[PDB]
């Protein structure tokens, strides 16, 4: 399960 | 219409040097990490489904005088993700849409600090009875537009 938007800061 | 009609191709400028096509057939054409897009890109700072291109028919609002390129159609770009995807010059955020032309340079993710860059060319190689092809050339001069019920219901069932 890979459910995660690396969101950049 | 041959098959192809919109060509996404990931340049060099981006990580990703591969090239993407979308099928006139097919609308509208998601892209993203999730398989699930009609284009496969997988990069952990776009959503599954980045973003995703939608064509419409283009038409103005009169011509009891002036002759324009009559009522075809115009493929727009749609954007969904939060990372935020840039066209050219125009800001796609979640809930974007914007019309791409021949030639048309995406940026589906940016990373000034990351040196993370990403972005698709758009290359209309077939156009299916275009009023042009996705130039627009209409009021506004090359404007992001923002998606309505019609569009996010597009990806509602993706």
């Known amino acids: 399960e890979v459910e995660l938007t690396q969101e950049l800061p | 219409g041959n098959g192809r009609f919109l060509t996404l191709k990931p340049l060099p400028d981006s990580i990703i040097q591969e090239s993407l096509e979308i099928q006139q057939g097919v609308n509208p054409f998601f892209?993203?990490?999730?398989?699930?897009?009609?284009?496969?890109?997988?990069?952990?700072?776009?959503?599954?489904?980045?973003?995703?291109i939608f064509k419409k028919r283009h038409a103005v609002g009169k011509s009891m005088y002036?002759?324009?390129?009559?009522?075809?159609?115009?493929?727009?770009?749609?954007?969904?993700?939060?990372?935020?995807?840039?066209?050219?010059?125009?800001?796609?955020?979640q809930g974007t849409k914007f019309l791409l032309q021949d030639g048309d340079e995406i940026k589906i993710i940016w990373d000034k600090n990351n040196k993370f860059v990403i972005g698709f060319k758009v290359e209309i190689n077939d156009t299916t009875g275009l009023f042009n092809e996705g130039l627009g050339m209409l009021q506004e001069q090359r404007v992001v537009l923002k998606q309505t019920a019609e569009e996010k219901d597009l990806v509602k069932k993706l």
Request: proline share 2%.
């Open chain 2, 31 to 52: 892209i993203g990490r999730s398989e699930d897009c009609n284009c496969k890109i997988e990069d952990n700072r776009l959503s599954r489904v980045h973003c995703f």
């Open chain 2, 66 to 93: 002036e002759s324009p390129a009559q009522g075809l159609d115009d493929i727009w770009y749609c954007h969904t993700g939060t990372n935020v995807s840039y066209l050219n010059n125009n800001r796609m955020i």
